[PDB]
Symmetry: D3
Subunit: 152 residues, 6 copies
């Protein structure tokens, strides 16, 4: 899908509490990606168990689920060329200690457990996460007036 | 309400020009830095139907058809913000309807030029806010959460 | 008049909300010279004196208690008309009346949590500077930018 | 009226204080179209004509000599009501009178060091644009954002 | 080496996306000295010469046509190691390879729409500056901040 | 420490060039936004004496006299910041000693050019931080306060 690739991103409860939602959104807007879905939600533990199913045998899994369910999150879908991989570069390493300055985690976070944002790790993960969090009628198609200036 | 006033809510929407011009984050950050509490948020493609109801007071103005068509022309970011005097204060942060009359420091004063592409809507009154919130959101979309910042914004 | 000085303090809410740097940057960008700075926990006794003119007001006790409740950033800034200009940058006491573009207009909601204190007059500034700082904390420096800020 | 143009110039103090980008960004973020730009040093002869309406004012000589003393960034911006709106963005002549949120309100202290010039009227802009720029320095370009700025 | 100079150009996509001021501010905040600036539309003849090292590359033709298609902001910046450092601030040619914090890493997606050109070497810079600018367009000014940037 | 590590402290100082160039607020804002806790702060005119001891280790370097003279050539903003891995992290945020080697996104990478005017000092190690904090601050200048934000920065 090339420039139509999509990723799932979510601002975690700490990002909402720390008033960093606009800052995060602005970084993806300024990069050139197209916002195609957005909502403030409180995720159920049932949903979050499915979301993090790959991690279910890790010792932190339970508290990760409980935490992500504990307050509002901002769920998003962004669209563009290589948006999955590039979003992960913008976000930075899982452990903010390893995330360089200039990344979101590098600039704003200290600890792995309070690392502001989730982004899909692969196109296949993105497909699964988008379907989990969003209905199809929440995913918008619009003609981007900037696209001529971002793409060949 | 009247208890303390702090649970007043307004409807704000980033119009299609705000999305196209990549100002969503900038607009949200201004309300975040002010101290208001985001209690609802969604990106939507608004139907002409809903918009006719939203702008019903402008039903017999000459621009009405172009406004509705335009607001339906692309995504809108619909929001509800909560806090003391949020309706009046949000109108001040946005600035005058005609950007030419909105001072620098306001959203319209800083970011736009013409009345027909003026980035954002905010409820003009508490009663308008009640009506607009109900029109645009379901009850279950309005979130109750515990704002760690409140202690530092409110006496 | 370029050596006029004012006393500004970031109140405990400004520290807690991580707005210290934002506030300092606004006075830097305006052209004023920072000549004193410290993070302190003010005593209630100091604060009772600082706000003595308000001692008969219903809110005086809670103002004092609050200002003593957490760290504040005490500052002295220097430049032409700095006292009045700083008050303009800060905005009205009640943030509801502070326009966008001002510190209180951009960042605050309520009169009791209004981020920052600034002296209200040159004589108030002299008094407040003396209350909060020793003479050896007030620095003198030659501003490389001054030729570009003053005629 | 969307093709109205104004002449703006970053004065020597704006260049020296490293505020050129900040100023340009304010006009870009507003939605105006940059149609001419150059870093130049103007002659006193050009400046005497630029400010010819102020020839009887006691500061005229000083103003001319100062504006000739260092580089300035000359610009033309295009858009609806650009002259009047640009003046609003810049703020009052005397920065003491310019509210926070304006360029002069945010960055300046004194009337002689007030960062930027903007034309005062459509007819003054026509005159100033002609004075500072060759016709071939004003560029026509198709504005991708035009549909989202204008109805 | 503090008098080294580089040629930078904001490409048509940077103008259209309203990123001129953002880009300039990044070089200003670094401490580099702006010594020439203009908004221009370059000829294919000039651009063929500009990019002559790339003449056997498959994209050469489309690169030349594109850079000729709309306005660019041509600039010269001065300072110690300005060529190499500017390239670092810009980031990798392909924005997919440019880290966050760089211009291309922060603002761009694709190699053909990568916002800005910067000279690749001191000798390339000398050639490019000569190609785009007349000698009288390069300004000598006394930098008020130089004592605080350099030893 | 070793309980959780969250009470580690570093000494940071904005050098005179950072004061003159009006980057104090910019610098402080980068540490605030990262989540570290400001526990001490003062503007000082550092004596040639204090500085000779600060930079004792560099006594045999040919630039030593010029470093001490420069660090006394205007005000310095002395700070103590607290948090998990604050010494190592602060060094990463500042970037390499030589700004030409500091990547964009770091303080030195974004804001300065030459090694002799490199804006800021941060402790290079936990032991150095212990020594620097002791040298520049009195114990009663290091404040214990309840950080509302810690709940959102720490698990
Ligand atoms: N060792 C850990 N302890 C606590 N939380 C962790 C740990 N490792 C990962 N996590 C949390 O689980 C989330 C999902 O892990 P993972 O998908 O591997 O990382 P990423 O979010 O960088 O793609 C992380 O973002 C983080 O919040
Ligand atoms: N004279 C006008 N010409 C064109 N569009 C207008 C005009 N007046 C209002 N509008 C449009 O209709 C919207 C609703 O108008 P109104 O409620 O009066 O303003 P506001 O949005 O400031 O509350 C405006 O925000 C603008 O988009
Ligand atoms: N009505 C009030 N209720 C609570 N606190 C108040 C009230 N009026 C003033 N204050 C507090 O007292 C501080 C000092 O008041 P004053 O000197 O009159 O205002 P300012 O700080 O704007 O100069 C204010 O900044 C505010 O924090
Ligand atoms: N009283 C004054 N003293 C010194 N310089 C002045 C004075 N009044 C105006 N100037 C300078 O002359 C410039 C041109 O004046 P004017 O056109 O009246 O103001 P503006 O630039 O706001 O349109 C001003 O921008 C300012 O630099
Ligand atoms: N494979 C490519 N496809 C399209 N355009 C390209 C490609 N490689 C390079 N370019 C364009 O050519 C310009 C000049 O290339 P080069 O000098 O090698 O890179 P840089 O601009 O990073 O110094 C690039 O900035 C880019 O816009
Ligand atoms: N080669 C040099 N020439 C001049 N000044 C230098 C040189 N190396 C270091 N300095 C200065 O001495 C300070 C201390 O050096 P060092 O401890 O090696 O760096 P850092 O401050 O990054 O820990 C530097 O921050 C810089 O101001």
């Amino acid at each position: 899908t090339g420039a139509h690739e999509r990723t799932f991103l979510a601002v975690k409860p700490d990002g909402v509490q720390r008033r960093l939602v606009g800052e995060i959104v602005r970084r993806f807007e300024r990069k050139g990606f197209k916002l195609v879905a957005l909502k403030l939600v409180q995720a159920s533990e049932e949903l979050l168990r499915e979301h993090y199913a790959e991690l279910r045998e890790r010792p932190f899994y339970g508290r990760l689920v409980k935490y992500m369910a504990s307050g509002p999150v901002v769920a998003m879908v962004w669209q563009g060329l290589d948006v999955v991989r590039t979003s992960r570069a913008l976000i930075g390493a899982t452990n903010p200690a390893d995330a360089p300055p200039g990344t979101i985690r590098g600039d704003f976070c200290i600890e792995v457990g309070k690392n502001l944002i989730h982004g899909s790790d692969s196109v296949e993960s993105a497909r699964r996460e988008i379907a989990l969090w969003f209905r199809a009628d929440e995913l918008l198609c619009w003609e981007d007036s900037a696209g001529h200036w971002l793409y060949e």
